[PDB]
Structure 1
Amino acid sequence: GIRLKDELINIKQILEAADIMFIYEEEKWPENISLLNENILSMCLKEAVTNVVKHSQAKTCRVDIQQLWKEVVITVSDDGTFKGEENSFSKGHGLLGMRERLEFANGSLHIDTENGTKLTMAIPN
């Protein structure tokens, strides 16, 4: 029930309070996304950033939110170190939670944990 523009403000506050530099510049903002898919993305954006704050030990977090072809794509990257096991998608927790909720919406969640942690989340639009 959170607009994505409002969630952006929440994550700026959370990252600043955690002494993590937030890097965001508006580019290709979605011109129309369903209120459902927008709200799913707000929830996933919040969780991606909760994870940065709780686990990463990052000094920087970069967020991109772009309409690309038939998807809205959100990427959240940080320059800390990934703390999870080889398979970090477990029942009852946010990575698998976000992936399952996105996939139900015919979207996707990918993760790269080489240079810190980067989450790419996409949903139809």
Structure 2
Amino acid sequence: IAELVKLEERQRMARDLVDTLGQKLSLMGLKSDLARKLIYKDPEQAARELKSVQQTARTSLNEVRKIVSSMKGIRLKDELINIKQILEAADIMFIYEEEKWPENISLLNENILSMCLKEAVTNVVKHSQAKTCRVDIQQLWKEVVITVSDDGTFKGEENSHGLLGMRERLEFANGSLHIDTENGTKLTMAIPN
């Protein structure tokens, strides 16, 4: 029926959401308990744990909210085709040495990495004045690591809206963002896999 064949991927996305929300609920449960045990002992620390529970809740809902209707996100292979066309239109040479594609990556995590990849490249175009942009995608043991390196110049002050958005979605997936702006801008994004 075709239209029902795409339900297979929507189902994989829905399961990923169930899995992630389950883990967040569970973490929030553990922190509320610890906080409860500090109420009298250490009320300032108790407040801080609960502020963290609140942030987990808000950020999780924030990350799930946009996916839930369609149960569809961006595929990393398509985003790679996309950012190659963006660099070409910008006349910035795309450098990519293809290695073994990551194998067992959740659709949620592909969407997160795709959005980060898109934002990183968008910044190369808008801010870097780079001549080149190298994209590395690595399956590294238990993680996937994408490095976006441009040979332009970093234009920012100390700060981090793109960069905060990336850090937030990556840390929601228990991954991380590193930025090095010494000689061009190298963005390293790592997510569990």
Quote the residue 1:31 is aligned against: 103
Deviations 1:15-62 (Å, cap 9, x if unpaired)? 000010000021131011000001100000000000000000000000
Gaps of 5+ in 1: none
Mark the structure with the bigger radius of gyration.
2
Q: Which has the higher strand share?
A: 1
Between the aligned partners of 2:158 and 2:118, the Cα distance in structure 1 is 24
Show the counterpart of 1:22.
94
1:4 and 1:100 map into 2 onto residues whose CA distance is 19
Instruction: Specify which structure has the bigger relative contact order, considering alpha-carbon pairs within 8 angstroms and separated by 6 or more residues.
Output: 1
Structure-1 residue corresponding to 2:68? none
Cα-to-partner distance string for 1:72-101 (whole Å, 9 max, x where unaligned): 0000000000000023xxxx9111110011
Post-superposition offset of 1:110? 0.3
SS of the residue 1:80 aligns to: coil
Provide the aligned length of Structure 1 versus Structure 2.
121
Note the aligned Cα RMSD (angstroms): 1.1
TM-score (norm 1): 0.94
Bigger shift: residues 47-56 or 20-29:
20-29
Report the structure, 1 or 2, having the larger helix content.
2
2:173 paired with 1:101 = no
Deviation, structure 1 residue 111: 0.3
When normalised by structure 2's length, the TM-score is 0.61
| Percentage identity across paired residues of the two chains | 99
Q: State the SS of the aligned residue for 2:157.
A: coil
